[PDB]
Design a protein around this ligand. Structure first.
Ligand SMILES: C[N+]1(C)CCO[C@@](O)(c2ccc(-c3ccc([C@@]4(O)C[N+](C)(C)CCO4)cc3)cc2)C1
Ligand SMILES: C[N+]1(C)CCO[C@@](O)(c2ccc(-c3ccc([C@@]4(O)C[N+](C)(C)CCO4)cc3)cc2)C1
Ligand SMILES: Nc1ncnc2c1ncn2[C@@H]1O[C@H](COP(=O)(O)OP(=O)(O)O)[C@@H](O)[C@H]1O
Ligand SMILES: Nc1ncnc2c1ncn2[C@@H]1O[C@H](COP(=O)(O)OP(=O)(O)O)[C@@H](O)[C@H]1O
Ligand SMILES: [Mg+2]
Ligand SMILES: [Mg+2]
Ligand SMILES: [Mg+2]
Ligand SMILES: [Mg+2]
Lengths: 306, 354
C-alpha cells in the first residue's frame, strides 16, 4: 500500500492490479508498452518505475470464452490482430520465441520432481508421450509450413480482450487487445492458431480444476474462414482486390498454416502448465490443464492426419 | 576508421536480426561499418547496406549503432528514447538490446559553440526547448533530480582520495570553498526562486544539437535536440540557465585540458531576451496577447530565474567533473573543468549580488 500511494502522488499530475488509473507490479516489456500506448493501440502509460507501472484504466470488461465465437466479435479480433501484426517494434525479428520457449520449458519439465503423489502420477502419464521426440515431430511439421514472421501478441485469449464500456453497439470498434507480456516477433500462424485453441478453454470456472475444456468449441471451418476473411484484408494491403479464386487459394493455404501452428499452442502451453504446477503459488489445476492441452495436441494431429 | 573484428561481427548480427528488409538477408561480407567514436564506453558506429543493395521496403540504408561499453536508468532512458521517437522529436529507434541500441542515422553535423549565439539558431533552440518542456512523460514529476544529483555527487567528492599530485592539489583548492555550505546557500537561493517544473533536457549543449543536412537555408526548422541521457522533470530555469552557460564552454579544443572556457561569451541581456522572447510564446500560445507591461514583468522575472538557476549548472557540473576525474579514464581535463565551473559560479554569484 505504502509504496503505491507515493507513486500516484508523484507520477500523476490534481494528484497485482489495483484501481486507484491502474497499477502493475523489464526493459523490452516497458518499451513495448510505451510504444503501444503512443500508437493508441494499448492503454496509456502514466508511470514507469521498478516496482511496477501506472497504466490507464479503461472502463470495460473482459470477454467470456463463449463470446469469441460471435461473428462480430471474431471479425474485430481478427482485425485487431492484423493491426498488431503490422507494428514495427525495435526487437529481434529472428523467430526464436516459439521453439526457444518450448525447449526452455521442456528442459525444466524433464527435471521436475513433484512431492504430491497425484502430481507424480500425472507427470508420469505426460512423460510417457516422449515429449523430446514429439517436439522434433512438431519442428519437422512446422518447418514444412511457411508462415510469415510478424509481431505477435502470443496470448490472444478472452481475458486479454477488453469490451469497451459504452461502445457495445459498435459493430467493428468495441474491443482492445491487452496484456503484452508474451508478445514477440513470431510466426503468424501461432498467433491465429493459439487464438482458435482459446475458443475451447474457459479459465473462469469456480470449482477445481478451475477451467473447462470443450473440444467441441474449436471453430468450425466456416468460423475459421469468417475470422481469416477479416484478418486478411486488414493485414494484406492488396488482398481485397484479388480475384475470388486467388482469395480462396490464400484462405485455404492459411487454414492449413493456422491449424498446424495450433499444435504449437497446445505443446507450448501444455509444457508451461507442468512448470506452473511446480512453481506457481496460484490455485489452479495446472497438471489437469497440461493433460487437457496434450489431449488436444494429439486430437488435432488426428484431425489433420499428421 | 574500421572497428575491430569482434565489434564488426557483433554489429553485423544486431543489424541483421533487428533491422527489416534487405538487412535480414545480408551476408557478413556485405556489411559496411565505420567508427564514429571509439573507446571503452559509448562507442558509435555507422552501419550501412552496400550501395548496390536495393531496399525492399521502407527500411533504412544506414543506421547508427550505439554501444554502451564499460538498471533503473536503463529502463527510463530506453522508454524515453522510444517515446521521443514515436513523437518525431528524436531519432527513430530501430533496435534495443542489453549492449546498446540501433538508431536512425540523421545526416547532420553538431553545432559549434560559436553558433549558439546566432539569432536564428538561438531562437530555434528556444522553440525546440519550449516544445520539449511541453511533453508529458511517464516519469516522476517531483523536481528531485537537481538537488538529488548534486547531493549525490558531493557525497562522493568528499570521499575522493587522489594519488597524483596535480589532482590532489586541485581537489584541495575546490574543497577549500566549503562545498557543503555553499550548496546550502545555493539551495536557499533557488528555494526562493519560482520556476515551473517541466520535462527538461538537462544537457542542451552544442554537441547535442544537430544541424540537419539540407535545411541550412531554413530559418526556423533546421535543428534537432538529441542525447536525452540526463533528461528529467526539473526546474525550467535549470534547462535555460544550463544552455546559457554552454555558450561559454568549447569541448572541441585539441590540447590539454581539451576544453576552453570564456566567461565573456555568456549571453548578454539582449541575447537572453531574444532567447526567452522565442521560448515564451512557443511555451504559451496565448503569451503574445498579454499587454507589453505584463510581458515585461514575466520576462524580467524569467531573466533572474534563469540566471539564478545557471548557478546550479555550474555547481552540478563542477561536482560531476570532480567525480569523473576519479572514475573516468577518458582523456579530458576533468579537474581543470571542475575549477572552470566553480570560477564561473563565483563570477555569476558576484554578478547577481553586486
Ligand atoms: C495463456 N497462458 C499463459 C497459458 C495457458 O493458460 C492460461 O491461459 C491461463 C489463464 C488463467 C489461469 C487462471 C489461473 C488462476 C485463476 C484463479 O482465479 C483460480 N482460483 C480462483 C481458484 C484462485 C485464484 O486464481 C484463474 C485463471 C490459468 C492459466 C495462461
Ligand atoms: C579528443 N580528446 C582529447 C580525447 C577523446 O575524448 C575527447 O574528444 C573529449 C571531448 C569532450 C569531452 C567532454 C567532457 C565533458 C562534457 C560535459 O559537457 C558533459 N556534461 C554536460 C555531461 C557535464 C559537463 O561536461 C562534454 C564533453 C570529453 C572528451 C577529448
Ligand atoms: N488497462 C486496463 N483497464 C481496465 N482493466 C484492465 C486493464 N488491464 C488489465 N485489466 C484487467 O485486469 C486483468 C488482468 O490484467 P492483464 O493485463 O491481462 O495481466 P495478467 O498477465 O496478470 O493477465 C484483465 O483480464 C482485465 O480484467
Ligand atoms: N541519430 C544520429 N544521427 C547522426 N549523428 C548522431 C546521431 N546521434 C548522435 N550523433 C552524433 O554523435 C554524437 C554523440 O551522440 P550523443 O547522442 O550526444 O551521445 P553522448 O551521450 O555520447 O554525447 C553527437 O554529437 C552527434 O554528432
Ligand atoms: Mg491477462
Ligand atoms: Mg499475461
Ligand atoms: Mg551528447
Ligand atoms: Mg550524453
Amino acid at each position: 500500500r505504502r509504496r503505491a500511494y507515493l507513486w500516484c502522488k508523484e507520477f500523476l499530475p490534481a494528484w497485482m492490479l489495483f484501481q486507484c488509473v491502474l497499477l502493475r507490479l523489464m526493459v523490452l516489456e516497458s518499451v513495448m508498452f510505451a510504444i503501444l500506448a503512443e500508437r493508441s493501440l494499448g492503454p496509456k502509460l502514466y508511470g514507469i518505475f521498478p516496482q511496477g507501472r501506472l497504466e490507464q484504466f479503461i472502463p470495460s470488461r473482459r470477454l467470456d470464452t463463449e463470446e469469441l465465437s460471435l461473428p462480430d466479435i471474431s471479425a474485430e479480433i481478427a482485425e485487431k490482430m492484423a493491426t498488431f501484426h503490422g507494428m514495427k517494434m525495435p526487437f529481434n525479428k529472428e523467430p526464436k520465441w516459439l521453439f526457444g520457449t518450448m525447449e526452455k520449458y521442456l528442459k525444466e519439465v524433464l527435471r521436475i520432481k513433484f512431492t504430491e503423489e497425484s502430481r507424480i502420477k500425472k507427470l508420469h502419464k505426460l512423460l510417457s508421450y516422449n515429449l523430446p521426440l514429439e517436439l522434433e515431430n512438431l519442428r519437422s511439421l512446422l518447418e514444412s509450413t511457411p508462415s510469415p514472421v510478424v509481431f505477435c501478441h502470443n496470448d490472444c485469449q478472452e481475458g486479454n480482450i477488453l469490451l469497451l464500456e459504452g461502445r457495445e453497439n459498435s459493430e467493428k470498434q468495441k474491443l482492445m487487445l491487452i496484456d503484452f507480456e508474451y508478445s514477440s516477433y513470431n510466426y503468424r500462424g501461432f498467433d491465429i492458431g493459439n487464438h482458435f485453441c482459446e475458443w475451447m478453454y474457459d479459465y473462469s470456472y469456480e470449482k477445481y480444476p478451475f477451467f473447462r475444456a470443450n473440444i467441441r468449441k474449436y471453430p468450425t471451418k466456416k468460423q475459421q474462414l469468417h475470422f481469416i476473411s477479416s484478418y486478411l484484408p486488414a493485414f494484406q494491403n492488396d488482398f481485397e482486390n484479388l480475384s475470388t479464386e486467388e482469395k480462396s487459394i490464400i484462405k485455404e493455404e492459411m487454414l492449413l498454416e493456422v491449424n498446424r501452428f495450433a499444435l504449437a499452442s497446445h505443446f507450448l502451453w501444455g509444457l508451461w502448465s507442468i512448470v506452473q504446477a511446480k512453481i506457481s503459488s496460484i490455485e489452479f489445476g495446472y497438471m489437469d490443464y497440461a493433460q487437457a492441452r496434450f489431449d488436444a495436441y494429439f486430437h488435432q494431429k488426428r484431425k489433420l492426419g499428421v
